[PDB]
Structure 1
Amino acid sequence: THRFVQKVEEMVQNHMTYSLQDVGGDANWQLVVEEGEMKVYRREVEENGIVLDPLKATHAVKGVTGHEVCNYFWNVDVRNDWETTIENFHVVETLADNAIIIYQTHKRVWPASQRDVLYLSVIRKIPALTENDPETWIVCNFSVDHDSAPLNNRCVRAKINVAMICQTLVSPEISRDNILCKITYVANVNPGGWAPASVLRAVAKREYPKFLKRFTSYVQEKTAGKPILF
């Protein structure tokens, strides 16, 4: 029990309530890019001329579990292996074995100024609602304030609320051949400051599918031929 346990519970529960709902019957979501089971949706939203466009994606990854996907998403020691848009990151505070506060800077995308972020990152297991249902693994990354925040005069401070939500199906020794992880990934980013709307939309449209294809392939790569961590 650290000082964020209640805020964590609330963000996690809001994701479980709202973020998992199916979009596809929902015309409010624009399906922007499909590549197989990878589907990436946005809503076009701006506040005081700043693009906020909610991002929502689903995916189905053969051969890995939700537990594994989330550990790898969460574990700072493998970040450099799959991240391509980060210039620097620092762990600012360890809250618990499942929660940390991270400071990170993103590579500049010309001509906007550089962005930095300060966020709590927590990984959690949500037991099945009934023995009929899937257990779920979630990572939530959401912006928080911290006294130890770096001074970075190059950077505008972005605010994020991101969740990677994972459910695992097995069609039955259980083999990697028989496992499928369904991912829901949501990212609500306020970039701060101003940035050209066209720049923000082009960076999102390029970087989110790249990230999901890349990150998920990395998890397949690292886990293959290892005992399955359900």
Structure 2
Amino acid sequence: THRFVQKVEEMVQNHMTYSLQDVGGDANWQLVVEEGEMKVYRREVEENGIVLDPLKATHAVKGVTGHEVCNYFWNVDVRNDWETTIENFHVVETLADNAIIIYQTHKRVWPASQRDVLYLSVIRKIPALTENDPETWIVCNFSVDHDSAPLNNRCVRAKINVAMICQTLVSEISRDNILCKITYVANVNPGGWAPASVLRAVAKREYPKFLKRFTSYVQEKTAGKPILF
């Protein structure tokens, strides 16, 4: 029990309530990119002339579990093996063995100024509501304030609320018979000002690239390892 336990529970619960819902029938979501099972949607939202566009994506990855996907997403030690848009990150504080606070800087995208982020990252297993329902693994990354926040005069502080939410279907169980269903949501306030066209182009390019790359890394690192359910 660190000082964020209840904020964490609230963020996680909101994601389980709202983020998991299907949006196939919801015209409010614009489907922007589809590549097979990977479906990437946005809402066009601006606040004070700053693009906030909520991002929501679903995906189905063979041969990995939600537990594996989330560990890989959460574990700072493999971060540099799949991240492409990060200049630097530092663990600011270890809250618990499933929760840390991270500082990171994002590669500049011309012509906007560089962004940095300060966020709590927590991984949690949500037990099946009923023996009918799936268990879910979730990673939530959400912005928090912290005293040990670096001075970075090059950077505008973005604020994020991101969740990677995983449920695993299975048919000795082999990788051949396991499917991981992902819902990934990212609400990012870039702060300051950045050209709308830039923000939307970066999102449209980088989210599908991230999801394809990250999931493929998980498949590759796990294949021929015992399944971690």
1:22 Cα deviation from its structure 2 partner: 0.3
SS of residue paired to 1:21: coil
Aligned-partner Cα distance in 1 for 2:59–2:122: 21
1:194 Cα deviation from its structure 2 partner: 0.1
Q: How high is the TM-score relative to the length of structure 1?
A: 0.99
SS of residue paired to 2:215: helix
Aligned-partner Cα distance in 2 for 1:133–1:113: 45
2:72 counterpart residue number? 72
1:195 Cα deviation from its structure 2 partner: 0.1
Aligned-partner Cα distance in 2 for 1:205–1:131: 38
**CA deviation map 1:18-63 (0-9, x unaligned):** 0000001000000000000000000000000000000000000000
SS of residue paired to 2:212: helix
1:128 Cα deviation from its structure 2 partner: 0.1
Aligned-partner Cα distance in 2 for 1:202–1:158: 17
1:133 Cα deviation from its structure 2 partner: 0.5
1:144 Cα deviation from its structure 2 partner: 0.1
2:190 counterpart residue number? 191
Alignment of 1:21-40 (within 5 A): 21-40=21-40
Aligned-partner Cα distance in 2 for 1:149–1:81: 25
SS of residue paired to 1:199: helix
SS of residue paired to 2:224: coil
1:119 Cα deviation from its structure 2 partner: 0.1
Structure 1 segments of 4 or more deviating over 4 A? none
Aligned-partner Cα distance in 2 for 1:70–1:88: 21
SS of residue paired to 1:200: helix
The number of residues matched between the two structures is 229
Aligned-partner Cα distance in 1 for 2:74–2:89: 13
1:53 counterpart residue number? 53
Aligned-partner Cα distance in 2 for 1:19–1:124: 15
Aligned-partner Cα distance in 2 for 1:112–1:150: 20
SS of residue paired to 2:67: helix
Where does structure 1 lack aligned partners over 5 or more consecutive residues?
none
Aligned-partner Cα distance in 1 for 2:154–2:136: 39
Aligned-partner Cα distance in 2 for 1:22–1:213: 20
1:15 Cα deviation from its structure 2 partner: 0.1
Alignment of 1:125-204 (within 5 A): 125-171=125-171, 173-204=172-203
Aligned-partner Cα distance in 2 for 1:208–1:113: 20
1:225 Cα deviation from its structure 2 partner: 0.3
Aligned-partner Cα distance in 1 for 2:193–2:69: 34
Aligned-partner Cα distance in 2 for 1:24–1:43: 14
1:7 counterpart residue number? 7
SS of residue paired to 1:140: strand
1:88 Cα deviation from its structure 2 partner: 0.2
1:114 Cα deviation from its structure 2 partner: 0.1
1:111 Cα deviation from its structure 2 partner: 0.1
1:16 Cα deviation from its structure 2 partner: 0.0
Aligned-partner Cα distance in 1 for 2:28–2:124: 29
